[PDB]
Design a protein around this ligand. Structure first.
Ligand SMILES: CN(C)c1ccc(N(Cc2ccsc2)C(=O)Cc2cncc3ccccc23)cc1
Ligand SMILES: CN(C)c1ccc(N(Cc2ccsc2)C(=O)Cc2cncc3ccccc23)cc1
Lengths: 304, 304
């Protein structure tokens, strides 16, 4: 028992982290096979970041200008190319620590672990969710660019995120591993509207099932609701509309606890309408949405 | 910016995790040099756990009865000994992945990362605090025994905890790496009083400094207090008494924000007396105490 914001063990990703220096800019890179992936803004200086002409800046750079350090040893850059907002530096040595990996584009509402790095060295690991507005409320300082988000299924690491930028609002933005930004963001130091965010209803409900599994049952009530009545409450409280697919993904948690999904919905409805009343659920005084139904079953079953 | 419950990157600890099977019991072990450390209850069966005679149970066991698997390869056990509540299985092969390490006894209120493992395989990593009553509110299922808690200073891993038991209350108990239980607990399946817990005042104050650093300032007020007046409030709200040493450990955060420690104390006093009023601080609707002053400066500076 016990329920925590658990991240995947970062070991397989730590072995892929390198330092990438171009000119006076240093950030992190992801060494997989004979390719180091890093944010393309490594080629910029502070003067460039207002509106960088990346194609032009990259043309002034050659293979020898990209310094790649993997711990204390230097990697030999034999090629370079830009793909969307990432640079792919081809190196003459495949990473011996390359795990089985995949490049995935995650959906908003899904979670992943972040391995925050500085100068190609890992500082820490935390679990977070891709917000419905495609931002991440991470913990990132200057030089954290190039840190990646991932999920691990057995021995296969699915890289989903690469860190590029902190918006003036303090929230974070980045790309998939093909360099495509999540959300409407661009890699320019400019005011960028993040868009209206919502709470991930399915994840809150999944977390409500984890609370019942782990002992917390005070919020359970004698009521039920319909998807329609629930969605009217979800609308008023800026919660994502709940669909039959969300009810289906909650099937296992519903079967384990014997609490019908619409019965759990009615409990969430009462919590939205009345608050916690000074009470807690799994050590939180607010409704948590950073745990997916899969994360709950994984943590409550013990998959390694 | 951004503030998260960040755990240390678990890589160096993952490389030390092995599976230890004795009879019909399987749990995790920590392979450092030519020694595998595991909870001594590996020698028990369900029938034994009510009141095990560990000296007697161990006498029926020989080196060949302790099966130690490091991934897919078997380790050869050449010696065995009990030290407090841990078994030390001497093996004929030093772990090639042994990092620079230390065995430390942590103080209550300090934090550490936990690498939850099952069958010698890591499932996840989370950050937690040693409660003032020496329990840990972890996330542990059956077979998680042998999972360790640690801190990492550069390349040196300081092992502080080993998991042994979940109390009937759902909280966790374990030992230092010399097998000494933290708190009054014994490795017997019996009702065990955990003792009165308190909130880690210094850590709450440290977290209040992290909130100001990361943008959250609504709780700052026009008041100040004394250690005496604050301690009267801390008493009423089951908070640890604040001492001059705690004020001294908060010196750096006070210097960075320019907010005097007693001024921050007066803000915490108002939050204790009036609650959050439906507001949040760093994404939490309650007062967080799982971040030490050192954790705050580390996360807000970027140490790797
Ligand atoms: C000097 N240098 C080239 C540089 C300089 C700044 C950045 N930018 C701006 C920007 C614009 C468009 S794309 C990035 C970042 O946003 C980098 C960054 C990320 N995360 C957390 C941060 C906290 C504090 C400062 C910077 C942070 C990238 C690069
Ligand atoms: C069968 N076997 C030998 C066994 C069987 C049970 C345990 N115990 C009891 C106990 C008594 C004294 S020392 C341990 C544990 O407490 C083990 C444990 C730990 N963490 C989370 C758990 C969740 C569910 C079930 C067990 C959990 C240890 C060993």
């Amino acid at each position: 028992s016990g329920f925590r914001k658990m991240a995947f063990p970062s070991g397989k990703v730590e072995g892929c982290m390198v330092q990438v220096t171009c000119g006076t800019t240093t950030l992190n890179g992801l060494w997989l096979d004979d390719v180091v992936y890093c944010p393309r803004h490594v080629i910029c200086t502070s003067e460039d970041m207002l509106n960088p002409n990346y194609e032009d800046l990259l043309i002034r750079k050659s293979n020898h200008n990209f310094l790649v350090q993997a711990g204390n040893v230097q990697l030999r850059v034999i090629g370079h190319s830009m793909q969307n907002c990432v640079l792919k530096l081809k190196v003459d040595t495949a990473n011996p620590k390359t795990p089985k990996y995949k490049f995935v584009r995650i959906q908003p509402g899904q979670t992943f672990s972040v391995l925050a790095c500085y100068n190609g060295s890992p500082s820490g690991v935390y679990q977070c969710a891709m917000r419905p507005n495609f931002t991440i409320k991470g913990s990132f300082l200057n030089g954290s660019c190039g840190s990646v988000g991932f999920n691990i299924d057995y021995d296969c690491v699915s890289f989903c995120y690469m860190h590029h930028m902190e918006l003036p609002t303090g929230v974070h933005a980045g790309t998939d591993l093909e360099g495509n930004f999540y959300g409407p963001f661009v890699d320019r130091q400019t005011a960028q509207a993040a868009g209206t965010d919502t709470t991930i209803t399915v994840n809150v409900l999944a977390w409500l099932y984890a609370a019942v599994i782990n002992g917390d049952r005070w919020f359970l009530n004698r009521f039920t609701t319909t998807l329609n009545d629930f969605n009217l409450v979800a609308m008023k409280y800026n919660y994502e509309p709940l669909t039959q697919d969300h009810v289906d993904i909650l099937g296992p948690l519903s079967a384990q606890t014997g609490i019908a999904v619409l019965d759990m919905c009615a409990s969430l409805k009462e919590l939205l309408q009345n608050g916690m009343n000074g009470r807690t659920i799994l050590g939180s005084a607010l409704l948590e949405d950073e745990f997916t139904p899969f994360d709950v079953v994984r943590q409550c079953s013990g998959v390694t």
